[PDB]
Amino acid sequence: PNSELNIYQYGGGNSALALQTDCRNSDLTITQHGGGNGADVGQGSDDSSIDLTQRGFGNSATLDQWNGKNSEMTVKQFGGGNGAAVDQTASNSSVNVTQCGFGNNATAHQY
Amino acid sequence: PNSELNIYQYGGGNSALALQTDCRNSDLTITQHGGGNGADVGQGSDDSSIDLTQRGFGNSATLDQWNGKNSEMTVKQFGGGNGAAVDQTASNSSVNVTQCGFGNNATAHQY
Amino acid sequence: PNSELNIYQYGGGNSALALQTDCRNSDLTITQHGGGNGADVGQGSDDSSIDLTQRGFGNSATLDQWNGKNSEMTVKQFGGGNGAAVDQTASNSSVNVTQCGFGNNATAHQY
Amino acid sequence: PNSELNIYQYGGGNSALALQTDCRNSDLTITQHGGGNGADVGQGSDDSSIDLTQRGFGNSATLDQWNGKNSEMTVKQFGGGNGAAVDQTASNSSVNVTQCGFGNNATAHQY
Amino acid sequence: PNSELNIYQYGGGNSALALQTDCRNSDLTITQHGGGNGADVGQGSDDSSIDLTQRGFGNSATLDQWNGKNSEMTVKQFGGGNGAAVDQTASNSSVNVTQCGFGNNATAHQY
Amino acid sequence: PNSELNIYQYGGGNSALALQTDCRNSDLTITQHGGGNGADVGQGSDDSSIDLTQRGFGNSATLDQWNGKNSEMTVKQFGGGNGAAVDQTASNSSVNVTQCGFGNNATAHQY
Amino acid sequence: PNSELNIYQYGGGNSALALQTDCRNSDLTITQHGGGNGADVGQGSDDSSIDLTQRGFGNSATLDQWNGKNSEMTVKQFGGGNGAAVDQTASNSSVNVTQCGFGNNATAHQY
């Protein structure tokens, strides 16, 4: 099972927690640009992907992709203080969240 | 097999376009409070729900839920100039967008 | 059972209440142009259609189509302060109200 | 039962009340031009028609068709202050009232 | 069982503690350029590799790769005061941490 | 094969090169205190130990423990500018070099 | 074969060259105190020992122990400019050279 977890941080004060378990041929990528961005990502889904990109300051993301197969996550937060929380369990399914600006809130649930 | 689509406007200058076709056992609800809020919503998903509530001024929402089953979409825009675009094709899934404040932008795509 | 309920509002201060239940293969359409127009429309009839058009200011319509089949109801209110009250329960039946001008009152019941 | 109720009002201050019940394959039509004309028309007869035409001001009409079949009732009031009172219950029968000018009163009963 | 642990230190004030136990056909490499960089690396995984490179000043790294097989760790800290903490126990898995700038904190967990 | 290679540096300008290959059940330790100390150490010997201690400034040590078994090398350099060059291939043998002061040169070979 | 070769140097500028080959259960020890002392020692004799002690300045020693068994070699040079050259090959034999003062020269051969 070729499973890859990548964390790239540029700037200062960004924090990332990542978990990949029982997750075969799947990719989890976190890329944070700027400052004070927080990420918490769990992936336990086969042939699945999670891409998290935060660019700016004070953005928060909590992502959970569990039990699914052939499933995709994209989260892109541009700006300041945006909040994202997503759970994805559906198979052959995809979730996309894109927040631009200040103070955005998004919660997504796919079963 | 009951299908309901509802529009409520309170205030002035709010505009709503709604479409429900091939959409069985499904509810689409559109409620705007205030002024200048714009909504364009399409629902063709069985056993599915759309709820958009706009409260404030200049909020814009474009919602599309097609080919899904047992799917729920909720968009709530509080304040001014919030923008939301939501696409929903997954079955047994939920999208929730909650925008608070001014100038918020959110696009959610869930397949 | 393609059931569609459409409300289009252009201008300011228009209010529409629409209800569609137990209503198969049926369309309800409300179109408001101008200002201060009030609409209350309920439809529970199979293979039926409601068409309410209000163009002007201060027009009010109360429209109820219940327990009929293959029934068409149309109200067209042009101008100011027109009042229409229409109840339709007869099957395979049509009601048509046309008001032009100011201060008109029209009552129609079809059983 | 293709039953149609039509109200056309042009001008200002005209009032029309129309009732259609148990009235199959039948037409009720009211046409008011001008101002202050009053109409009260009841229709409960199968395959039968009412045509009321009031053109002018201050004309009053009280019209009832009940329990008839294949019955035609036409009232035409041109001008000002004309009063008409017509009751029709006979089947396969026709009532025609024509008033032109000012202050005419006409009463017709057909059983 | 060819097990190699290499440490290269250039400059001054860099300190590194490295432990390799029960770790067959596996490579652990530490390379520090500059000053005041701290490293603590434990490797007990078969056919696994850990590569740590710190370039700059005041960077801190804590890396634990345990019980895995065919597992890769890459940690690269460029700049000042970066902190990294990574634990990997998953087999056939890869963790990559890259920090650029000042004051980054990165945590990686892979089981 | 529990094989551990540790280098501790306290102070500034110290440089340490260490390689451990084909070396089962063996420890290589380098400890540098002060400034500008240079060490290069290779270990390929089974059940062997390397202890290099440099305390001061400008000390240089070149240590090669190859093809031996049950072999110990200890080199201790206190002060400034000491040079030691030691090669050890003999099995069940021990080499001990102690330099105190300034400008010492010592060469040790054991086959 | 427990074979030990130890060189202890205290002071400055001391130089020692030491060779132990084919020499089982044997000890070779050099102790130099002071400055400029030179030692060159080869040991290839079984169950035998070499002890060289130089205390002072400018002392020189060339010691060769070969093909003997159960042999002991001791040279003690105290002071300045002392010279010692010793070859031992005899079995069950001991050579002892003691030089005190300045400018002493001693040659020992035992076959």
Author numbering:
A (entry chain D), B (entry chain E), C (entry chain F), D (entry chain G), E (entry chain C), F (entry chain B), ...: 41 to 151
Provide text from the study.
We chose an engineered CsgA with two designed cysteines (A63C and V140C), developed by Balistreri et al., as this selection offers several advantages for structural analysis. The final CsgA fibrils for cryo-EM imaging were formed in 10 mM CAPS buffer with 0.01% Tween 20, pH 10.4, without shaking, and heated at 70°C for 30 min. The chosen box size corresponds to the number of included CsgA monomers (the length of the fibril) for generating 3D models. Acceptable initial 3D models were generated by using box sizes of 218 and 260 pixels. The overall architecture of CsgA fibrils illustrated that seven and eight CsgA subunits could be assigned to the map of 218-pixel and 260-pixel box size, respectively. Fibrils comprising approximately 7–8 CsgA monomers appeared to exhibit high stability and uniformity, potentially indicating a characteristic of CsgA aggregation. The CsgA fibrils model indicated that the adjacent strand distance and helix height are approximately 4.8 Å and 19.1 Å, respectively, exhibiting the closest agreement with those (4.8 Å and 19 Å) shown in the predicted CsgA model. In addition, our E. coli CsgA models also confirmed the previous prediction that the core-facing residues between beta strands are imperfect repeats, leading to the formation of steric zippers that are non-centrosymmetric. Additionally, a central slice of the CsgA fibril map in three orthogonal projections revealed some additional density on both sides of the fibrils, likely attributed to the flexible N22 region. Due to the limit of map quality as a result of preferred orientation, the real resolutions (around 4–6 Å) are lower than the reported values (3.6–3.8 Å) by cryoSPARC, and therefore, the detailed interactions between these molecules within a fibril need to be revealed by further higher-resolution structures.
